[PDB]
Amino acid sequence: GNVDLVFLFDGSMSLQPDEFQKILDFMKDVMKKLSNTSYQFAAVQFSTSYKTEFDFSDYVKRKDPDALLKHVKHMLLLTNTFGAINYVATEVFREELGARPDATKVLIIITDGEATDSGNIDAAKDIIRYIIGIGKHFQTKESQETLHKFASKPASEFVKILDTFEKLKDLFTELQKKIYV
């Protein structure tokens, strides 16, 4: 079946320039590898506020990862993950914006720490949520477990902890394999 996937990427002040750039390249690589498939994409940047870098309809109009992300600017603010996931649920996955009703909703969240806000993400729980926590903040099991609440179950599959942003390239594989079974 069809798959509508949204990249929700962290743009807080805790990420270094090169780190932020590696997220961008990850999104581009994934897209290029999935061009001309059942996949349709959208991408939202989150820090303090939520910015839809491109909606599903922008992707359909121009299936060019480089052009779609061309003007992305690292926000350098907070890490409002609750507001971010909720925004994706209500503002991104809409037919008006190009979302397909027959499609499987997938969300790939990339971040380096804990949310600076709070609440619940119940409105986005139907979406297949993969979360990629990266860096020094996720060394212990205790710290890694804070990501569990944003991901699908079990956490053993949907929560991916990387020690470096360099680990992003060697990660595209796993995802698409499990995204449809």
Side-chain angles (χ1 to χ4, degrees):
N2 285 342
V3 178
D4 288 350
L5 184 160
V6 179
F7 294 106
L8 176 59
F9 64 105
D10 193 340
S12 85
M13 56 177 71
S14 57
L15 288 78
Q16 296 172 66
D18 294 348
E19 297 189 315
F20 182 75
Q21 181 58 62
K22 288 184 186 66
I23 297 179
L24 294 185
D25 301 332
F26 165 77
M27 299 191 287
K28 293 183 185 188
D29 285 325
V30 172
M31 290 196 274
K32 286 164 182 167
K33 290 251 60 276
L34 292 166
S35 61
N36 313 299
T37 61
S38 34
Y39 286 73
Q40 172 177 92
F41 304 99
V44 177
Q45 190 188 347
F46 77 92
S47 188
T48 294
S49 44
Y50 327 108
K51 170 62 191 307
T52 294
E53 301 297 12
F54 69 84
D55 286 297
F56 291 116
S57 53
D58 296 315
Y59 177 85
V60 174
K61 196 195 292 178
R62 56 236 300 176
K63 308 178 198 311
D64 180 2
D66 297 295
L68 293 159
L69 300 164
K70 185 181 55 153
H71 297 119
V72 172
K73 295 294 179 283
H74 186 185
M75 296 167 160
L76 277 318
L77 303 166
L78 306 178
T79 307
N80 297 340
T81 324
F82 282 97
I85 298 175
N86 275 284
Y87 170 90
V88 167
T90 56
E91 312 307 311
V92 179
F93 282 111
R94 305 176 56 222
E95 281 202 58
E96 297 81 5
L97 293 167
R100 306 170 289 179
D102 68 289
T104 298
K105 295 184 183 167
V106 179
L107 189 33
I108 296 186
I109 311 156
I110 309 110
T111 186
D112 76 358
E114 283 171 74
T116 42
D117 63 351
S118 58
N120 75 57
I121 60 149
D122 297 346
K125 306 257 296 209
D126 55 320
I127 307 171
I128 298 302
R129 297 149 286 119
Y130 275 96
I131 187 145
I132 306 175
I134 311 175
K136 74 184 183 67
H137 178 248
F138 299 119
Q139 291 196 18
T140 57
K141 288 267 270 278
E142 194 212 345
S143 46
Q144 300 162 13
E145 289 165 5
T146 67
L147 290 170
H148 290 15
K149 62 191 180 276
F150 302 132
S152 285
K153 295 283 136 275
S156 65
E157 161 63 20
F158 303 92
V159 180
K160 312 284 185 199
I161 306 298
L162 312 184
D163 46 54
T164 68
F165 278 74
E166 257 85 7
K167 294 170 83 180
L168 273 176
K169 258 76 275 176
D170 259 45
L171 167 62
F172 317 156
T173 57
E174 295 178 54
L175 302 165
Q176 200 255 21
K177 171 71 86 64
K178 312 288 288 187
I179 295 177
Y180 241 3
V181 278

